[PDB]
Design a protein around this ligand. Structure first.
Ligand SMILES: C=CC1=C(C)[C@@H](Cc2[nH]c(/C=C3N=C(/C=C4\NC(=O)[C@H](C)[C@H]4CC)C(C)=C\3CCC(=O)O)c(CCC(=O)O)c2C)NC1=O
Ligand SMILES: C=CC1=C(C)[C@@H](Cc2[nH]c(/C=C3N=C(/C=C4\NC(=O)[C@H](C)[C@H]4CC)C(C)=C\3CCC(=O)O)c(CCC(=O)O)c2C)NC1=O
Ligand SMILES: C=CC1=C(C)[C@@H](Cc2[nH]c(/C=C3N=C(/C=C4\NC(=O)[C@H](C)[C@H]4CC)C(C)=C\3CCC(=O)O)c(CCC(=O)O)c2C)NC1=O
Ligand SMILES: C=CC1=C(C)[C@@H](Cc2[nH]c(/C=C3N=C(/C=C4\NC(=O)[C@H](C)[C@H]4CC)C(C)=C\3CCC(=O)O)c(CCC(=O)O)c2C)NC1=O
Ligand SMILES: C=CC1=C(C)[C@@H](Cc2[nH]c(/C=C3N=C(/C=C4\NC(=O)[C@H](C)[C@H]4CC)C(C)=C\3CCC(=O)O)c(CCC(=O)O)c2C)NC1=O
Ligand SMILES: C=CC1=C(C)[C@@H](Cc2[nH]c(/C=C3N=C(/C=C4\NC(=O)[C@H](C)[C@H]4CC)C(C)=C\3CCC(=O)O)c(CCC(=O)O)c2C)NC1=O
Ligand SMILES: C=CC1=C(C)[C@@H](Cc2[nH]c(/C=C3N=C(/C=C4\NC(=O)[C@H](C)[C@H]4CC)C(C)=C\3CCC(=O)O)c(CCC(=O)O)c2C)NC1=O
Ligand SMILES: C=CC1=C(C)[C@@H](Cc2[nH]c(/C=C3N=C(/C=C4\NC(=O)[C@H](C)[C@H]4CC)C(C)=C\3CCC(=O)O)c(CCC(=O)O)c2C)NC1=O
Ligand SMILES: C=CC1=C(C)[C@@H](Cc2[nH]c(/C=C3N=C(/C=C4\NC(=O)[C@H](C)[C@H]4CC)C(C)=C\3CCC(=O)O)c(CCC(=O)O)c2C)NC1=O
Ligand SMILES: CCC1=C(C)/C(=C\C2=NC(=C\c3[nH]c(C[C@H]4NC(=O)C(C)=C4CC)c(C)c3CCC(=O)O)/C(CCC(=O)O)=C2C)NC1=O
Ligand SMILES: CCC1=C(C)[C@@H](CC2=N/C(=C\c3[nH]c(C[C@@H]4NC(=O)C(C)=C4CC)c(C)c3CCC(=O)O)C(CCC(=O)O)=C2C)NC1=O
Ligand SMILES: CCC1=C(C)[C@@H](CC2=N/C(=C\c3[nH]c(C[C@@H]4NC(=O)C(C)=C4CC)c(C)c3CCC(=O)O)C(CCC(=O)O)=C2C)NC1=O
Ligand SMILES: CCC1=C(C)[C@@H](CC2=N/C(=C\c3[nH]c(C[C@@H]4NC(=O)C(C)=C4CC)c(C)c3CCC(=O)O)C(CCC(=O)O)=C2C)NC1=O
Ligand SMILES: CCC1=C(C)[C@@H](CC2=N/C(=C\c3[nH]c(C[C@@H]4NC(=O)C(C)=C4CC)c(C)c3CCC(=O)O)C(CCC(=O)O)=C2C)NC1=O
Lengths: 177, 164, 309, 59, 146, 164, 177, 164
């Protein structure tokens, strides 16, 4: 379980040197980018069942063979575990947006999921589709470009942090594929 | 590795929920006390060699019987092990000082520390003499600001109270 | 395989997610540390327990399988998907038997003591699990108190402070663990059993005291996952790692062997065919052999005096 | 022309074996005849027979 | 917005070239014993000189890539088919790819001042984007040598 | 294909006689050893894909130079042929393991292998590196009980001694 | 868990015959060699942290890359587990010196350790080195040839029992390699 | 040994006849091509030692892994055998170059080479690296005028196409 801080500390431990100036300077850019990250995590948290519901119902609408009889969404409890799993994916992505480092997301869920879904028969392309929908939806909330919600924040550029969030979702989507 | 962010992420993870506003306030306080921590880290990375030099020199200045037979740092190699150990300590004080929690200093230095010393017949009191020398000596305003100083002394105090 | 492993891990996470409440961890279960002594000592006790679990003989793994499979089938009533999980994923089923037994708070230590005969009966069934571990005069090594000298002292301390933790529970969850422990002891009651259920009736402590199964086969499958954590090394790195000559011992093709010639007879026709003669090159390797390692602490300061013998 | 400007190969960092030095002729008498022409020492090495042509035109 | 910061980065990599080239090629020689030995590609004095010249040229055109800020200058005819020339002269390509990797790592460590030994004084900033452009160019070329 | 049945039938055919009790005892031994060998074949068809992975990855873990130049491993496609030929050999170990003689592994894999491998510049040492890796990764008392493992060792021995 | 008694009884059980004369006669030589084995185990027990400290510190002095950063002794808790593991090795070797048969040592520790150290990345060569140092140190105590401790026992020849202890240490060192 | 004389005398011996004018024209061609080839042989015996040096040094200049492990080039002694076998092959190129057929280079070098090189852990690709280096170091208009060089190329071609 490693943040930005523990990434710098672990790398400086492998080098066995002290922390110094430039690494801390990049971490000063992290601290100065702090409140943007705080408001970003607040935006992704305050739209949870929003993103999960739209994302998974969009996944079914893209490929309707899931709700077809014999599919993996075809049972009520299977839809329940489907919604729950999408929710937990969004949860660890939110933890990775707090942390600034994807080590927590690598340790919670990303390790051992592909072989699990092979063991259960979950279609990995459909999960990558759902993670892609949560990616574009979440970045659309993080730029505040949601076409159903426009909340008040002061103006600033957050394209880099948005690319960071897209890096987490692309890490999940690359992980399941 | 303990920090504000790992404790709150592990906490909301333990609840199985998304991070609420409380965790956001916690990491907000992390990015408040951050600049004082990293100031102390910059100065420690600046003058670590002199700090370790004064630490070991005062450590054998208090206890001379370490250079006695064959009980302790009696040879040049063992005293070299002394100075490199102190360096590891200041390196871990710098590491936990950057992190802001006592995580990496605990899991790298403190954990299993008691068992190793007894096995090697390493006296912990002389370590305490070294760190309390570096603790007593520092000046809050001259070298650095008082707040960073407080943070540094606190970390070093943790080392002492975890040692014996 | 590793499928079973991840399933077991997440079932333990949803297991321990209970009692963590809404963020405040409810120190009634989740402290597990006591003092700082036993805080560091419980990690070594858990690693102790895991390694002694894989030390268990190969016969016990499978009796462990049919017991945990039986228990996990009782755990889900009907629930064909769930019984399918209990048959198809074994270590998940172990984590769900133990994890159910955690999320209920059914376990004995979490019970406080208010009457004496409850703990007398508890002591009797305690002795029954003691007899089922130790067979013959030979102590079983599932016991695993000491791993080195002085560890099991901290096991004493952790067990007794663990008894002190039972008392400062809210009386709500105490009455929960009573009724709930009763229900559990009738789920897995091995038949209908008027006497077992009535001795459970007068004694909720005894309803706590049923050890269904053990953790041999779930440890058997995992092996070292608990110690290693996330550091499965790839075959390419493991061959090129530290254990090259031991990971892959049979790797070598035609090991060269140097024969023990007498120096008097050179035995035949040899040409060095080298850029540097062997005499000269062996000389160079012996001269350049090992550099004195200079040290920073002994580095010349401003001023100096040369020491005199 | 082939000249590196900012460039140092250390040859102390190498492993102890793998510095090999070779002399074309290990003798005094044959590295320098009494007369000036030489195939090893001086600018006189420029005037050996052969090597007048070039095989880098294959690129 | 970059300007003196991007120029500052290019001046950091440029006034560190001697260390970077001789660093990576000496570390390349150290990595495998055979190049130095007689009959090796880099045994004769001239071939070592052309080796250091190639290191200096790679790093030089990567520096030219940065000021323009576009990869188009970094490519073209001389670079292209470089692999055709190194095949047609028997030059090892795994060795060159290692040297390009070492040049990359030394370049980023100079561009972030994390390299212990040089502490040129600049006011602090974020420069991660530009570092990724630098590593971007070195692995463009490092993919082209193989 | 050389097996027990084909050797004794073919030998009795060359004899010009009915099969006497000697051949009957030979096939008696075949139906004795059969279960041990076939347990080996079932487990081989179990996890052959991980045998492809660890086998080829160890095969390039030893020799890296094949991926270096144009020679034998220039592209990823030739590496796919590398893993491919390894799976051919493992499938022939499964076949000869089922038959019980070295028949199909001889006539399908070994026969005329040397003109092909010598012609197309294919080194045998990398194959031998792969197979020795597989015999070094023999989990006997936990995976292939005893004698199933033994039969697998014998077949793969015959593969190396055929190639080397 | 089998001593020499259980070895004779199990082998005579596989033969299904009674114990007889000669096997019991060799076991009579065991009983007559009893007090030598008792004093031997007393000598190895009364030098425990002695042998562990000198052995493992000697192991680090032989190959100093373990204390180097990135090594397996490079953490304080790793050194703790290092010293503890050497102690437990010496403990089961002492149990095998009591038993006279290495079945206990095969069942406690020799089963499952190589795979474990491969899974952790513990260098097996270094462990075989430390077991070899404990071998020569322990045999030097068992002949009473320690150059810093010379305790009083009456004179007797114990080279065979010393070769037995060296067989246990060579069983461990061959087990880790 | 296959030469012009041995092929035509052996062919006429198989015929059962006196050697007619056809064989006479064949040995006429032998004494025509003789001078060009023998110039090649004289120059080969001239600088063979530097051919050993550049040949073997290029042989390990291409493949370095032979000097790495125990496999085929563990010691300096095996490298002495490396240079040694290269000088055997050059001596056979001198012999077949004198004879003018590929006789002695076939019966002394090529025959049974494959069981030996396969049995031992030797890759023919290193030999072929050496010989391709020697044909890349062909100084035609300055060293071996024209056709002497051509005959040298032909013989060394036959060496590679025998081995590969
Ligand atoms: C404890 C919780 C907690 C939060 C949740 C934040 C919320 C927050 N954000 C800002 C401030 C800010 N927040 C953003 C963020 C945004 N940039 C955009 O392009 C998006 C619309 C949005 C990210 C999704 C920006 C750009 C500012 C600075 C606004 C400005 O100065 O113009 C401020 C004012 C103080 C400051 O400048 O930092 C506060 C209180 N702070 C906290 O203490
Ligand atoms: C990273 C943290 C860090 C520190 C906290 C300091 C601590 C420190 N101070 C001194 C050294 C010193 N510190 C002081 C300060 C004092 N003067 C007094 O009148 C007061 C008692 C006190 C200020 C409150 C003085 C006077 C010296 C020089 C002492 C001397 O040379 O006599 C030295 C020895 C090296 C030197 O001479 O600078 C060190 C390590 N240095 C560090 O690297
Ligand atoms: C001090 C009080 C005290 C008790 C009250 C018992 C309770 C008890 N019963 C069993 C164990 C058992 N109890 C029964 C009894 C039953 N058979 C059935 O058909 C009925 C449902 C039921 C009788 C009415 C059976 C059959 C077992 C063995 C279960 C099994 O192994 O499958 C065990 C486990 C140990 C063992 O196998 O003996 C225990 C603790 N033991 C005690 O120490
Ligand atoms: C003619 C030559 C020439 C140069 C070499 C540059 C030098 C230069 N750099 C900056 C200024 C700067 N230079 C850097 C550069 C960086 N800081 C970091 O921490 C990173 C290590 C590094 C990445 C490249 C930064 C961050 C600034 C300040 C921010 C900015 O001015 O944009 C300035 C602004 C004035 C000043 O600071 O006094 C100037 C003139 N400009 C020139 O005209
Ligand atoms: C029935 C059994 C059976 C086999 C065992 C294979 C054996 C085999 N491999 C190749 C052919 C090949 N085999 C390899 C494999 C290698 N690549 C390397 O880097 C390694 C040295 C090695 C893997 C360990 C390659 C690269 C080729 C193509 C060679 C080339 O075209 O240059 C060919 C020629 C036909 C072809 O191109 O596919 C054959 C017969 N084929 C069979 O039918
Ligand atoms: C309860 C604890 C307990 C012990 C620790 C032993 C101690 C012990 N050892 C011996 C006796 C002895 N002990 C040894 C041992 C040896 N001599 C050597 O020179 C070797 C260094 C060493 C190898 C082990 C020998 C040789 C004897 C005498 C021979 C014998 O009695 O068999 C005796 C016989 C009585 C006596 O000597 O006074 C006793 C009681 N017995 C016990 O009951
Ligand atoms: C049909 C043939 C056949 C084989 C040759 C094996 C080969 C093999 N072994 C493992 C896997 C393994 N093999 C072993 C075996 C051991 N590791 C040790 O360190 C011990 C020395 C040794 C026991 C003596 C272990 C421990 C693993 C799991 C972890 C690992 O990779 O080492 C795997 C990965 C799948 C798994 O985890 O089971 C495979 C394919 N499997 C087969 O089906
Ligand atoms: C028995 C047969 C036999 C040969 C065929 C030659 C082959 C040969 N040539 C050279 C050596 C040489 N050969 C040439 C020739 C060349 N100059 C060029 O411009 C062209 C590419 C090429 C002529 C077509 C040159 C220039 C050298 C010297 C190379 C140098 O020292 O840089 C050497 C090394 C020893 C030396 O320096 O002389 C050898 C063995 N020698 C023999 O003993
Ligand atoms: C008449 C012609 C004639 C030849 C051409 C050689 C060919 C030859 N070489 C070896 C034997 C050998 N040849 C080599 C040579 C090699 N070392 C390497 O690193 C390279 C791959 C290669 C040089 C290019 C080596 C190393 C051995 C010994 C192999 C071993 O014992 O492992 C042997 C076996 C007998 C011996 O050990 O000497 C033979 C017959 N011998 C002859 O009689
Ligand atoms: C509840 C009574 C009980 C206990 C405590 C038991 C077995 C057992 N589990 C034990 C441990 C144990 N089991 C748990 C289970 C647990 N973790 C969770 O997150 C939840 C929700 C849990 C159970 C409700 C904990 C926290 C511990 C404490 C950590 C520790 O002390 O090792 C112990 C204590 C000593 C030991 O490890 O052996 C024992 C004896 N069987 C029982 O019935
Ligand atoms: C008929 C079956 C069906 C669906 C179900 C939707 C699902 C859907 N939502 C999208 C994408 C999407 N969805 C939302 C979230 C959503 N919009 C909001 O403004 C609020 C408040 C939301 C939650 C209530 C956003 C913000 C986007 C990004 C596009 C945008 O700007 O609106 C996308 C585009 C995916 C992509 O870009 O690759 C799809 C397919 N589409 C379908 O065809
Ligand atoms: C209140 C918290 C608490 C505990 C929990 C225990 C744990 C404990 N067991 C011990 C030691 C110990 N434990 C057992 C095993 C155990 N006994 C048996 O007869 C059977 C069948 C067992 C498994 C069911 C044995 C056999 C011993 C050795 C002492 C003895 O002879 O009983 C020791 C002594 C350690 C030492 O000698 O250094 C302790 C501290 N003590 C506590 O204070
Ligand atoms: C024993 C055989 C051997 C070598 C030779 C070195 C060679 C070497 N230098 C590196 C990398 C490297 N080298 C230098 C340059 C160098 N450092 C300076 O501070 C100055 C002044 C230099 C020239 C004198 C820098 C600046 C780096 C980047 C790392 C750093 O921050 O120091 C790297 C890391 C490569 C990578 O990141 O992929 C290597 C392997 N390593 C070896 O194992
Ligand atoms: C610099 C890094 C370093 C070390 C650490 C030592 C470690 C060491 N001790 C040895 C061996 C050794 N060690 C001891 C134990 C030791 N001696 C005593 O008299 C007492 C009281 C002891 C515990 C305090 C004994 C008794 C021996 C046997 C040799 C002897 O007679 O002293 C040996 C010889 C091993 C062998 O024979 O194969 C070594 C290498 N050596 C090193 O190079």
């Amino acid at each position: 379980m490693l943040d930005a801080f523990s990434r710098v500390v672990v790398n400086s431990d492998s080098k066995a040197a002290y922390v110094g100036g430039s690494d801390l300077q990049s971490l000063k850019t992290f601290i100065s980018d702090g409140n943007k990250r705080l408001d970003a995590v607040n935006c992704i948290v305050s739209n949870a069942s929003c993103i999960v519901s739209d994302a998974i119902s969009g996944m079914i609408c893209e490929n309707p063979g899931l709700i077809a009889p014999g599919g993996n969404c075809y049972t009520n409890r299977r839809m329940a575990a489907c919604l729950r799993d999408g929710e937990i994916i969004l949860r660890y992505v939110s933890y990775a947006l707090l942390a600034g480092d994807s080590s927590v997301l690598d340790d919670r869920c990303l390790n051992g999921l592909k072989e699990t879904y092979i063991a259960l028969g979950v279609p990995t392309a459909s999960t990558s589709r759902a993670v892609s929908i949560m990616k574009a939806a979440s970045t659309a909330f993080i730029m505040n470009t949601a076409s159903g919600r426009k909340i008040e924040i002061a103006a600033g550029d957050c394209q880099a942090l948005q690319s960071e969030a897209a890096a987490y979702f692309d890490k999940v989507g690359s992980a399941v594929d | 590795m303990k920090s504000v962010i790992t404790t709150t992420i592990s906490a909301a993870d333990a609840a199985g929920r998304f991070p609420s506003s409380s965790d956001l306030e916690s990491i907000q306080g992390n990015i408040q006390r951050a600049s004082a921590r990293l100031e102390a880290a910059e100065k420690l990375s600046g003058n670590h060699e002199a700090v370790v030099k004064e630490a070991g020199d005062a450590c054998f200045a208090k206890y001379s019987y370490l250079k006695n037979s064959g009980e302790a740092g009696d040879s040049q190699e063992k005293i070299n092990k002394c100075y490199r150990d102190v360096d590891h300590y200041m390196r871990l004080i710098n590491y936990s000082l950057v992190v802001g929690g006592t995580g990496p200093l605990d899991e790298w230095g403190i954990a299993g520390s008691r068992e190793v010393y007894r096995t090697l017949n390493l006296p912990g009191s002389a370590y305490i003499a070294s760190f309390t020398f570096t603790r007593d000596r520092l000046c809050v305003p001259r070298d650095m600001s008082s707040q960073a100083g407080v943070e540094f002394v606190a970390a070093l105090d943790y080392v002492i109270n975890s040692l014996s | 395989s590793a499928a079973d492993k991840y399933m077991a891990r997440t079932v333990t996470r949803t297991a321990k997610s209970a009692a963590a409440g809404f963020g405040v961890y409810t120190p009634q279960c989740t402290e597990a540390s006591g003092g700082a002594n036993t805080a560091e000592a419980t990690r070594l006790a858990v690693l102790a327990a895991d390694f002694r679990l894989r030390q268990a003989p190969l016969g016990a793994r499978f009796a462990d399988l049919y017991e945990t499979r039986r228990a996990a089938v009782i755990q889900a009533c009907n629930s064909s998907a769930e019984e399918g999980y209990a048959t198809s994923f074994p270590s998940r089923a172990a984590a769900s038997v133990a994890g159910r037994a955690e999320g209920l708070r059914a376990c004995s230590r979490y019970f406080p003591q208010k009457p004496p005969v409850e703990e007398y009966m508890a002591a009797c069934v305690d002795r029954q699990y003691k007899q089922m571990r130790v067979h013959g005069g030979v102590y079983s090594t599932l016991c695993a108190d000491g791993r080195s000298a002085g560890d099991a002292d901290t096991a004493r301390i952790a067990a007794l402070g663990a008894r002190f933790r039972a008392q400062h529970l809210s009386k709500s969850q105490q009455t929960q663990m009573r009724y709930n422990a009763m229900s559990e002891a009738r789920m897995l009651a091995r038949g209908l059993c008027t006497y077992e259920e009535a001795q459970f009736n007068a004694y909720p402590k005894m309803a706590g005291m049923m050890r269904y199964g053990t953790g041999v086969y779930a440890a058997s499958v995992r092996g070292p996952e608990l110690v290693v954590g996330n550091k499965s090394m790839t075959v390419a790195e493991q061959v090129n790692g530290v254990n090259a000559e031991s990971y892959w011992p049979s790797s070598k093709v035609r090991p060269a062997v140097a024969r023990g010639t007498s120096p008097w007879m050179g035995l035949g026709v040899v040409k060095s065919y080298a850029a540097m003669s062997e005499a000269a090159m062996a000389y160079g390797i012996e001269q350049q052999s090992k550099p004195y390692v200079p040290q920073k602490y002994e580095g010349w300061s401003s001023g100096w005096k040369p020491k005199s013998s | 022309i082939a000249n590196p400007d900012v460039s140092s190969v250390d040859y102390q960092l190498m492993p102890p074996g793998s510095v090999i030095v070779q002399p074309d002729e290990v003798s005094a008498a044959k590295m320098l005849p009494v007369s000036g022409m030489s195939k090893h020492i001086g600018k006189t090495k420029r005037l050996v027979e052969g090597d007048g042509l070039s095989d880098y035109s294959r690129l």
